[PDB]
Amino acid sequence: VDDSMPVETLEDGTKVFTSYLFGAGALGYAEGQPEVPTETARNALGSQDILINR
Amino acid sequence: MPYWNDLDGDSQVLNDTDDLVPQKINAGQDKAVLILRGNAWSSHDLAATLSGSD
């Protein structure tokens, strides 16, 4: 059960629901890597600090 | 930087009824220049990780 799925609308306020039926278990994905996966910088004449992810 | 140029001139007719005259020396100048240079270069990152070497 999830609240976020594609839902469309036609005129006269009628709705259409999608509801994928997968039951697969599964497809696949992998994480991989960049370089510099995380970093921090700052602005000295001001006062700030940052984060990055990428 | 300075320098002293060397003396030159006639001897004279060593003679009576007259006297001699002494003589003089000069000086001179020299210069130089200071110069300075430099440059830079760079790269992207994404390209580095995607290309297989650095």
Swiss-Prot record, chain B:
Give the subcellular location. Virion
Instruction: Give the family this protein belongs to, as stated in its UniProt record.
Output: Belongs to the lambda phage major capsid protein family.
Protein function: Capsid protein self-assembles, with the help of the scaffolding protein gp11, to form an icosahedral capsid with a T=7 symmetry, about 61 nm in diameter. The capsid encapsulates the genomic DNA.
Give the record's subunit note.
Answer: Interacts with the scaffolding protein gp11. Interacts with the decoration protein gp12.
Name of the protein in question: Major capsid protein
Q: Which gene encodes it?
A: 13
Whole-protein residues included: 56 to 109 of 324
